[PDB]
Design a protein around this ligand. Sequence first.
Ligand SMILES: [Cu+2]
Ligand SMILES: [Cu+2]
Lengths: 654, 654
Amino acid sequence: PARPAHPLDPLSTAEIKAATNTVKSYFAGKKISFNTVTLREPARKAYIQWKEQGGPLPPRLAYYVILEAGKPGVKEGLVDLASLSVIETRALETVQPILTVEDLCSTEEVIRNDPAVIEQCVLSGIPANEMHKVYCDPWTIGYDERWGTGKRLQQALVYYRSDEDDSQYSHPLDFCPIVDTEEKKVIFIDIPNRRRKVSKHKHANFYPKHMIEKVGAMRPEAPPINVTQPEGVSFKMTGNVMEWSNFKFHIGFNYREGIVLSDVSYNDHGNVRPIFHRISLSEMIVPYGSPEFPHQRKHALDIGEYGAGYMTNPLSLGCDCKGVIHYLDAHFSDRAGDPITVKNAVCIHEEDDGLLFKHSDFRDNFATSLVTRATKLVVSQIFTAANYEYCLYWVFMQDGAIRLDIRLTGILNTYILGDDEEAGPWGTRVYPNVNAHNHQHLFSLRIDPRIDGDGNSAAACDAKSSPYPLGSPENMYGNAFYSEKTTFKTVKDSLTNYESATGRSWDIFNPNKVNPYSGKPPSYKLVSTQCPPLLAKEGSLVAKRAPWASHSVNVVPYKDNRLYPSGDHVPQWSGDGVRGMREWIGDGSENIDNTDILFFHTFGITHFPAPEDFPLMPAEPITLMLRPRHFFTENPGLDIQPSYAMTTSEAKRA
Amino acid sequence: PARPAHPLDPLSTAEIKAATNTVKSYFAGKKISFNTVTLREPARKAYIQWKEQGGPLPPRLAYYVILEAGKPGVKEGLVDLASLSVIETRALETVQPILTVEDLCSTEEVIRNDPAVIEQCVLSGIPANEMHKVYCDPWTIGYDERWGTGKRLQQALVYYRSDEDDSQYSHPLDFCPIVDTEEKKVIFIDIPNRRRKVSKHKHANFYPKHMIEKVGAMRPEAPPINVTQPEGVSFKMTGNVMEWSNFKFHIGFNYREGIVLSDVSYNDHGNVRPIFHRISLSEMIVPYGSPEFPHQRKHALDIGEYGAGYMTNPLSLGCDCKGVIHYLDAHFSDRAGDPITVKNAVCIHEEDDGLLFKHSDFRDNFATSLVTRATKLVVSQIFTAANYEYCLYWVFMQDGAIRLDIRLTGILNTYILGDDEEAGPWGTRVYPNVNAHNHQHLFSLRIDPRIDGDGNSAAACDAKSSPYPLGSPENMYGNAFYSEKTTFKTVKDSLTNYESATGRSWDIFNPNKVNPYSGKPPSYKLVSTQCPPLLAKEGSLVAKRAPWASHSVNVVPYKDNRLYPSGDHVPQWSGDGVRGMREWIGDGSENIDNTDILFFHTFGITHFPAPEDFPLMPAEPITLMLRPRHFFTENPGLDIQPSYAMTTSEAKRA
Ligand SMILES: [Cu+2]
Ligand SMILES: [Cu+2]
């Protein structure tokens, strides 16, 4: 073939087709379809050897997942692209894999044509000949103990539109078809004991034409705010390699995690210093809080069950990325093994970010003054998970901090509410006959650190008052306080939650090195307070399927291919068994002090819906930050030209 | 004097001058000087009666605080401006008042000329002929049990500059002069047991000429990011009254709080609904955590001891404020009774704030899509508290939320460290011979609410799992959870802290009304997680002088002139006695359910310095939000013109 320059680059369309031809011919004479065809990233060691020790260029490898008509489960393996050969393969009869766009799109038509569904629609007050008005969002079944992984199943959350331009969410139906993905057939419908017929209300709609009817008129177009960069941008991309304000890193992308940032370094006045080997979102879970059947099956693990790459929007087509933008495209396989392309999947731009720092001297009434403005680099994507929109922004900053900002928008998952029916305490009546259930949105940030090089550790940092009492020689006036650092020795030590009582943060640090001034190891500190406990109980489906979510922090030894904390093949796993994070934690005893580590952080929000969220939700923000502390010997932004600067001597002259 | 357009408008220069003339006449023949002349805001009931019920126009009042030579304490009172007379007067012999720029600017020359100080400078390795190189930041003594309020005192934190353009903070000296503010003399010097002579290291500097020497060159000027509004702004000011995106409110300013936002309402399609009567920062405390003498005296309450108005920066020059800006000026009194003006004390602009909301339909590959961008309105000031800079941004949003964003920047407070000397655990060595002590920055946000009118209450909201166990009929799969709402009945109920274990928020709501969809009262929800516990122990000087800071939330009955929770005259109060928040809480039994209430919220950060913070610190962000929840019956931003919109029917067409 043709090799790309960079070993971390995503598979090209050529390489995807090369992978699938190879798999086609290895399974000669068998009806197979493609589920995933994606880069197998090289071993961390091989990569670092090639980057830094003159080691050989790692082989280019593609990971595939296929189904075979008439065989249970899946098959997966590795194709070596240089040699067009399958070098590893195995059958997994008892898992089900990520649901692709194609697996999903056929479900509405299946339910529209199914006779028992048609009858449920009639019983709900919709005539058999208006089946074109019935829509469904197709989900994994998630987990249902009636079937396990024995068939590949979806559940169809059913809605009604009066008009194709309606937002269907004001109009859920009461029942839930279960659909065999591979047979394209409804196998069961969950029907509640109390039937609730379709709402007779107007749809709750949100397009300008709708809004003109509903409130009289749109607001006048607002006077514009324009953003130009006449001399272009300060960042520089070579392929997928970004350089900007001393940062250098590789921007990757795959079907599952969406954006993957690799090989992050900071150029400290000629000394190029590693910070992270890899950072990405590795799994999510969005557990709903109504205990009534079948709503326990709402607990999407969006990343593992659908894919933040597979679900991602082409950007620009609307006004998502405002300004001077560099775009990246995404490439996948379809069922037949032909490359597909999502254009402008990733957007890269730089924005003003307010003040970086400022100080003035009161002595000459602030005539002595220095002000420097902040610019941030944003690498972003937006994915749509049926009703939800997840807006993901990786932000680099000029003090050397890296921030992840998320904005949740889209539409509430809704279920039907009867005239007389109370939504509380599990949900909110956000509109007549509409129940919006409580839920949480949780994410697992996976960090593979390489803080100032190799051999890292992690720690909790808790603010504590001095243990000495008020009025003692040691704490006369009772004000003394310090930071108590707890270095994690073994896996089990790391299993920790955010604590407001101590303003807890976590350090990822290199214990082999030492800041010359402070005497502390160089570190990036995780500052993150949007860290909900998992509300679902110990031993619940939610806690079993997402064992990473029960702690804000989980730190385990590095091994290759430890990406996905809820397992490689997420849908319809019951949560029983030793896999993903539960495997990596083990008996809890393995060393994580001064070695190669992986730090998985759980964060997100608990959402109690309100009418403000409906029919379309205003963005709700989530952020965490990773700040250098004792990494530099001083403010690393001081060499950036000030916006304004006047010395005490210049002030006197002026 | 001519009366203002609006009863909440700050005193004009003419009104200040009339007020001071009147006070000079009342005290004819007495050697008085002026500490404060400022608006006494109308009673809440009078303002509301005037505003909404065709009631009496409230008297225009000036409040004053004066000192008299050779008399202890202060005198304070009220001038009726219409009649140019003093209508209320009292002598307070045992308090000390806020320190004005003028009280402060004197101290440095006092200590330079004091033979005992000069001697200490010589002992410290600075020759007596070089006293012009010795500087100090003059702080209130804060509290010292050796003097009480018996004399008006400052403590001088002494530093050295080799050159006038140096940042002095790398070179603190070891001793602390105590200066009598009215006598203009040094009455004592705290001298430590272990002498540490002045640092022989170079100064840690940060202007471009300094960075050129230190690191060789400045980074090149970056390509610019230009922001223009060629058609003007969408906001409208009429005097101090702001209208923007359905919000209407009054922007005030005083010497102490700085920005005061009043009479805040939202125009909900022609129904103009009150939200807050008043919102501001009403106090701070910045408690240091080294127990060693005399560092217990560092716990500045910046608002009540110096004033966020008096300390505020004129904003135009820095390019602090980027874009099309509307400026307000502040007017105070000087010591002689003449009006002083700080130009451009408040900056007002609207900025881009990303996505307001987005949703696309996967059925036609996101062809069906609606995207609306968010604009935010920012009302901001920046104040300098000797070494610190506090950047304050009141932010209104198009979903009807209001946010306070703060960024801390400027310079760490530094004290000297011997060559030998360990900084930890109370401090960090951020540069050779420099100890930056641990400290908290805490703020008391004061909210006078009027949520959808009169009669309000407050509650804590705590996410909880169902109490029913996993596997019971009520919670079969262990996923059920709800929001537990605890309405405060009496003051004691309200005294509450942020809790990560429940992701706690607080509602301010109108129990007299009901949302017609959700059945819940209309509310603004306080969402705030940067809520440190107070680390100083109970009974400590810090906890006594700031009784409000030991709880994240305090809610008390409304009374006129309950502004300042550490008392009206803060410097040198021991923290003993029933005043400020202690007085308002009383015995904790008074009703606060469905009445006029005041909600005081403590938030901030705990700061453990690192070398990154020095010699000048990159901005550190703090934020809280007040969000409408069950206030509206739907997303209130839906009538804003989308940036992009395509319906399903429109997408079928091309
Ligand atoms: Cu949500
Ligand atoms: Cu600080």
